[PDB]
């Protein structure tokens, strides 16, 4: 159960990244003000959908903090292992919600760049590949984490402990690592755009 502690670090990472995401939404909205009107190209709905997933991620983080405290109160008593798996489910869900958010910000930047820069620059052709790659890498890890969660849950019947829980911990970690890369790419692109206008 170094796990319960690690879960806390994983959750803290996910909060760190959410703050970071929010600073990029801020950057896009500024750029968008200067380049567009808003009532067209799917931008009213973008705004509405950033808000819907932001709300969603706030709830998952709230729900996850509460489960975390619970797990911390339960290290000595035994009858644990169930909260640990519950928590893995909670972090996975947070990661997915944040993936919906990156995909949105990613779309936003593509739309803006299309209008004001030649996509052909070497810097932007790498960006496009790196985005496509990290996005595939992330879905793969999510797909794989989903498969493991179900396996872990089914094996909590008579398991008596598992590497399944440790494999899953790894999975969630590697997904977050990947989101960070994607997060760095989106910050680079806003910086290119902002340098072009502002």
């Amino acid at each position: 159960s170094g796990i319960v502690q690690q879960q806390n670090n994983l959750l803290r990472a996910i909060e760190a990244q959410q703050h970071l995401l929010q600073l990029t939404v801020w950057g896009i909205k500024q750029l968008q003000a200067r380049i567009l009107s808003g009532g067209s190209g799917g931008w009213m709905e973008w705004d509405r959908e950033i808000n819907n997933y932001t709300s969603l991620i706030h709830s998952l983080i709230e729900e996850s903090q509460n489960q975390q405290e619970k797990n911390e109160q339960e290290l000595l008593g035994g009858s644990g292992g169930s909260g640990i798996v519950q928590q893995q489910n909670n972090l996975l869900r947070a990661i997915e919600a944040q993936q919906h958010l990156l995909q949105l910000t990613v779309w936003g930047i593509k739309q803006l760049q299309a209008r004001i820069l030649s996509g052909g620059s070497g810097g932007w052709m790498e960006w496009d590949r790196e985005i496509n790659n990290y996005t595939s890498l992330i879905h793969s890890l999510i797909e794989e984490s989903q498969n493991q969660q179900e396996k872990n849950e089914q094996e909590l019947l008579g398991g008596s402990g598992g590497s399944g829980i440790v494999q899953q911990q790894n999975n969630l970690l590697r997904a977050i690592e990947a989101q960070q890369h994607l997060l760095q790419l989106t910050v680079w692109g806003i910086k290119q755009l902002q340098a072009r206008i502002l």
């Binding site: 170094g2 502690q5 690690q6 670090n9 760190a16 600073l23 440790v166 960070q180 997060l183 760095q184």
Partner: protein, 34 residues
């Protein structure tokens, strides 16, 4: 403000690249056990 914004990114992007330190060098303790 952009140059504030650019401060706050590089310095969460500090925290996380710290937390992802901790979580990796726990996973390599965890991967010890199993």
């Amino acid at each position: 403000t952009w140059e504030x914004w650019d401060x706050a990114i590089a310095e969460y992007a500090x925290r996380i690249e710290x937390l992802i330190x901790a979580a990796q060098e726990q996973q390599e303790k965890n991967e010890x056990a199993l």
